[PDB]
């Protein structure tokens, strides 16, 4: 009945585009209805707020309500149910009547989908009647009003697709708040850190750059996480007092020490948050978008990738580059989104560079292991693909890595069945929806490009093809040095091993097998070495040049026909 | 659950064989139960009606119910299923109990296949339990009914094979409502047009001949379409009366004119439906099921020798099935047309199909070959599966030498499996026509008598025949006739077949469009258009 005059517009930031639409669609036909009365125009606009969960929908609808000043009727869907089938409609009939009786008025149906789901699956009689009562109540607004003191019903929900189409048709105005951009997140961070003590090194613009895919709720956790880091020094001092009072692992003792006193509360000095604590806070906070379905960042760096300079240049100029400098690349017409289909013989490093790109781009990473999205139920197999891109867009920039993609988009022959074709078509449409300025970088890897659909390789789709093939003799030297370096002979002996004619067809995996064979040959030599020198555990196994000599003899290339993989 | 005395026996026709069985299997153990009572034997008969959809299954069960007069309980299978799993059996247990409580009674389980499906593949618990509930409710009828009165269960379904064998066994009487024949469709058409005013030219036998593959529902649309055409004259007269009363587009005014009077009613003269409107109505109505070709003998030029052979082995034994059957002339399963390609083998097969008024299916060669072990033979069997259902039907296998090669030692196991399937189906009102240009490669078991043992050679025209064909082609699309003689007698058409002459006419037509285009930059088909058409058309 009264506005909630405790949250203001200043407390909600980053919604500048959303607040612009809400000015001419909610505020105006609630306070300046006289102009509409002079104009003679009924306002039947049902304003619907939708977007990712945590974007500040509930808070905004309460901040707007407190600012407009007109009578406000907050409605919570679970609180509508009282304990009787007929009483549920009584609560709804007591809202649309009260708003009409107290027009102009604002109705907020928070979590509308909790009582406005799909009626097709609504088997229960009570559930299907609440939707009918709600939808009829909107027509009464258009009828029982002077066409001047309009009543606007505002509904907020994080699942706009769950609304009954009988209801969503009645909500003409739909406001997609979406996720805030880099400029918007800076505004939120400044707004959030307004009652706190801060240092001078805090660059909120820098903080916004390295928090992609965060929403207003997620940015609140980053501030909250940084506050805890600011109090870390005030806990160690509290721990030290407990240690000095008392003459099991260390963390357990800390709980036991603080459990002891529980009454001798000591003053926490009022320190301020530095910039180093904010960087620590961002790492500790996982955004709500990255909670589910996002793979862990691989441990592979460019130091783990030997040679492949041509592939590295293409990857550092099409994916890693645009992620680091989205403005430098967009000046030369390089859009911050790409689709790359890595292909080549097996064992040559297609997955290795994709794991290095995911790790060297510092961006979000989603990995799909072949036909991981297929499900035995109807529609759920296709919904997984659509939901896959529903989070890749929300967490842009994001890297989608389809490993062994020939199993997910096979050639649409007669022997395909009406289950994977429905997924290939869905995957084709989603790749079309990936905008040039969307921020999704799709990487595909397959070792049999002759079995992958040719429709996936068109522009807009995975139209960029990078060939990863067998290394040359000079190329294997970089790879063999890279492999030996990452496991610890020096580097001059590695050139002799890699340039040997017995490694003519070796791929990247074969060179790794060569090193493992030499390592096993060392241990066999060590086992006999420690039996002649002993009959004390001080034996030193070291990979010697003679171990490489017998490793070259017993290792053959895993690739049979190198030219079999150059045909597509 | 009272019997509706709405649809009568007169309103259901063409079921004379069906109505004879239903008299001693439904009427007797519902009205004359006393005779069973004296003998002391309950008569429990579950009558099952099945056939193509639209054959008049639902209507028959309601016409019988209204004539018997006993209590009737219409049951629709989808409405039995309720929101709760246990409520579906509740609906069924409230039916078989009600019939027992209200014996004698008639139960109509319309669309039984919607719930009495095969519980084997119906692995879901509710699906497999409806069938069990149905079967137990029928046993209680045999057990708990009195000796005096019987309860008859009538089931209708268009897919009798989908029924659970535990259920189809409970329906002893099965009536397969096939599709009506020419004699039967005439009875249906007369029954539908019984309360209407008709003219004298209406030949119901002619209507039945030119409506093959139609069912009772389709024939109701044909009657409904002809009735609307019959009222077209009654609307123009109605519009003129409104115009004469009142001195915005025209259709809007017509609505406004008729809104004026309303309560003021003027007489509609009682006109009658002619036969020409019935012929128009049939064309406008597309049956749910192929279609008689539009090619007549006026589209076929010359080929009189081929026509006589075709008019004596196929076309004749269709128009007068009794005149030919009087002298012992069985309708040969078909004709094996052969000759060079492009000479009118498919054209004449479409002409035979049109002067026979039967359905036509055309195969353009090896369309039936499949890489699988069974689908290649199933395509041939499905070809004859529809041909029987739409009898009379003409099956035309064009370039049949790729579908039935000679079963020599070098044949493998893919074409032999197709020849055998085709041989058995030809043994099983279907007129199969085959065409091939290499008769030395077709199996000799096909060309035996009873199978396609009649061979008619359709070959290249010499010179006079092309004149008739070119005149025929030009006549059906609208140069005069003196220029057509010059075109057909030109030495450049030495090897032209029927298709080449058709290609020649299209080339001349295209040459006309080039002339119109240049005329409008600075239409009658002229001789100069034929001049450049002769150059750009080859016999191939």
């Amino acid at each position: 009945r009264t506005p909630p005059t405790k949250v203001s517009i200043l407390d909600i930031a980053g919604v500048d585009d959303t607040l612009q639409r809400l000015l001419k669609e909610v505020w105006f036909p609630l306070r300046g209805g006289e102009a509409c009365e002079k104009m003679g125009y009924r306002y039947d606009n049902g304003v619907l707020l939708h977007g990712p969960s945590g974007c500040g929908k509930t808070t905004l609808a309460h901040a707007i309500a407190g600012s407009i000043g007109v009578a406000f009727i907050p409605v919570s869907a679970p609180s509508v149910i009282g304990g009787t089938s007929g009483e549920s409609e009584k609560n709804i009939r007591d809202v649309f009547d009260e708003a009409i009786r107290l027009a102009p008025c604002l109705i907020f149906l928070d979590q509308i989908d909790a009582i406005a789901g799909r009626r097709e699956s609504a088997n229960k009689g009570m559930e299907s009647r609440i939707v009918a009562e709600i939808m009829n109540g909107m027509d009464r607004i258009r009828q029982n009003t002077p066409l001047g003191k309009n009543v606007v019903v505002l509904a907020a929900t994080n699942r706009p697709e769950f609304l009954d189409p009988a209801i969503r048709r009645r909500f003409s105005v739909e406001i997609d708040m979406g996720m805030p951009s880099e400029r918007a997140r800076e505004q939120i961070l400044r707004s959030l850190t307004r009652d706190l003590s801060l240092a001078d090194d805090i660059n909120f613009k820098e903080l916004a750059k390295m928090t992609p895919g965060y929403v207003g709720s997620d940015l609140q956790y980053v501030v909250k996480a940084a506050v805890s880091e600011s109090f870390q020094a005030n806990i160690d001092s509290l721990l030290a007092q407990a240690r000095a009072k008392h003459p099991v692992s260390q963390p357990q003792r800390d709980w036991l020490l603080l459990e002891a006193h529980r009454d001798e509360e000591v003053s926490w000095p009022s320190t301020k948050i530095t910039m180093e604590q904010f960087r620590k806070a961002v790492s500790l906070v996982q955004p709500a978008s990255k909670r589910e379905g996002f793979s862990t960042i691989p441990d592979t760096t460019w130091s783990h990738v030997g040679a492949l300079e041509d592939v590295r240049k293409k990857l550092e100029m099409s994916i890693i580059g645009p992620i680091k400098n989205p403005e430098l690349f967009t000046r030369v017409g390089i859009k911050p989104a790409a689709g790359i289909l890595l292909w080549g013989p097996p064992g040559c490093g297609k997955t290795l560079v994709a794991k290095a790109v995911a790790n060297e781009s510092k961006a979000n990473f989603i990995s799909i292991k072949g036909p991981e999205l297929l499900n035995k139920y109807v529609g759920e197999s296709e919904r997984a693909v659509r939901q896959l891109f529903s989070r890749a867009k929300s967490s842009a920039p994001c890297i989608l890595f389809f490993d062994q993609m020939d199993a997910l988009v096979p050639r649409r022959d007669d022997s395909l069945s009406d289950a994977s074709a429905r997924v290939v078509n869905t995957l084709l449409t989603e790749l079309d929806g990936v905008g040039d300025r969307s921020g999704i970088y799709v990487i595909g890897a397959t070792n049999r490009p002759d079995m992958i659909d040719e429709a996936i390789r068109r522009p807009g789709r995975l139209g960029t093809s990078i060939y990863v093939g067998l290394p040359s003799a000079e190329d294997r030297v970089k790879i063999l040095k890279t492999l030996y370096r990452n496991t610890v002979t020096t580097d001059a002996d590695l050139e002799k091993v890699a340039l040997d004619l017995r490694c003519t067809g070796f791929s990247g995996a074969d060179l790794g097998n060569l090193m493992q064979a030499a390592a096993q040959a060392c241990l066999e030599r060590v086992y006999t070495q420690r039996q002649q020198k002993r009959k004390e555990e001080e034996i030193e196994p070291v990979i010697t040049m003679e171990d490489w000599e017998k490793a070259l003899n017993e290792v053959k290339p895993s690739v049979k026909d190198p030219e079999k993989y150059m045909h597509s | 659950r009272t019997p509706p005395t709405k649809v009568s026996i007169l309103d259901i026709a063409g079921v004379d064989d069906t109505l004879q069985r239903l008299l001693k299997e439904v009427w007797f153990p519902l009205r004359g139960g006393e005779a069973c009572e004296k003998m002391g034997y309950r008569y429990d008969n579950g009558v099952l009606l099945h056939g193509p959809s639209g054959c008049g299954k639902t209507t028959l069960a309601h016409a019988i119910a209204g004539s018997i007069g006993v209590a009737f309980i219409p049951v629709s299978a989808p409405s039995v299923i309720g929101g709760t799993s246990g409520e579906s059996e509740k609906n069924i247990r409230d039916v078989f109990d009600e019939a027992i409580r209200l014996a004698p009674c008639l139960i109509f389980l319309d669309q039984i296949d919607a719930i009495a499906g095969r519980r084997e593949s119906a692995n879901k618990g509710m699906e497999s339990r409806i069938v069990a509930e149905i079967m137990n409710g029928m046993d209680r009828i045999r057990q708990n009914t009195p000796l005096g009165k019987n309860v008859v269960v009538l089931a209708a379904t268009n897919r009798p094979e989908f029924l659970d064998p535990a259920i189809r066994r409970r329906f002893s009487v099965e009536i397969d409502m096939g599709m009506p024949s020419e004699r039967a469709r005439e009875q249906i058409l007369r029954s539908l047009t019984r309360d209407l005013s008709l003219a004298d030219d209406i030949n119901f036998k002619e209507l039945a001949k030119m409506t093959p593959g139609y069912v009772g529902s389709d024939l109701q649309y044909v009657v409904k379409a002809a009735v609307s055409e019959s009222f077209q004259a009654n609307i123009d007269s109605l519009l003129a009366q409104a115009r004469a009363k009142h001195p915005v587009s025209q259709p809007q005014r017509d609505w406004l004119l008729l809104e004026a009077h309303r309560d003021e009613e003027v007489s509609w003269p009682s006109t009658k439906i002619t036969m020409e409107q019935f012929r128009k109505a049939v064309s406008l109505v597309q049956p749910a099921s192929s279609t008689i070709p539009d090619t007549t003998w006026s589209h076929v030029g010359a080929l009189e020798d081929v026509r006589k052979k075709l008019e004596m082995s196929i076309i004749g034994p269709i128009k007068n099935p009794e005149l030919f059957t009087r002298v012992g002339i069985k309708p040969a399963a078909g004709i094996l047309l052969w000759g060079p390609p492009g000479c009118g083998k498919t054209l004449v097969a479409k002409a035979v199909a049109n002067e026979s008024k039967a359905n036509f299916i055309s195969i353009k060669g090896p369309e039936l070959l499949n890489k699988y072990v069974g689908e290649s033979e199933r395509a041939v069997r499905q070809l004859f599966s529809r041909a029987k259902s739409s009898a009379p039907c003409i099956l035309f296998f064009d370039q049949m030498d790729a579908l039935v090669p000679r079963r020599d030692d070098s044949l493998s196991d893919a074409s032999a499996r197709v020849v055998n399937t085709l041989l058995t189906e030809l043994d099983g009102g279907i007129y199969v026509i085959g065409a091939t240009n290499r008769p030395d490669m077709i199996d000799e078991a096909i060309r035996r008598p009873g199978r396609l043992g009649t061979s008619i050679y359709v070959g290249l025209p010499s010179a006079e025949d092309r004149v008739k064909i070119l005149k025929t082609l030009y006549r059906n699309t609208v140069t005069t006739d003196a220029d057509l003689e010059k075109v057909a007698l030109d030495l450049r058409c030495t090897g032209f077949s029927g298709a080449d002459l058709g290609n020649l006419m299209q080339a001349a037509a295209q040459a006309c469009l080039e002339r119109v285009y240049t005329q409008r930059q600075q239409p009658v088909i002229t001789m100069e258009d034929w001049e450049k058409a002769l150059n750009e058309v080859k016999p191939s």
Binding site: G83, T84, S85, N123, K376, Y377, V378, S381, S415, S417, A419 | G83, T84, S85, K124, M126, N370, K371, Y372, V373, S376, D413, A414
Partner: peptide
């Protein structure tokens, strides 16, 4: 009024098949 727990129908699934080739 007391809301009781009521069982309902089940979802449908997909089944893969194997098809022979005469070639």
């Amino acid at each position: 009024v007391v809301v009781v727990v009521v069982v309902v129908v089940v979802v449908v699934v997909v089944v893969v098949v194997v098809v022979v080739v005469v070639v």
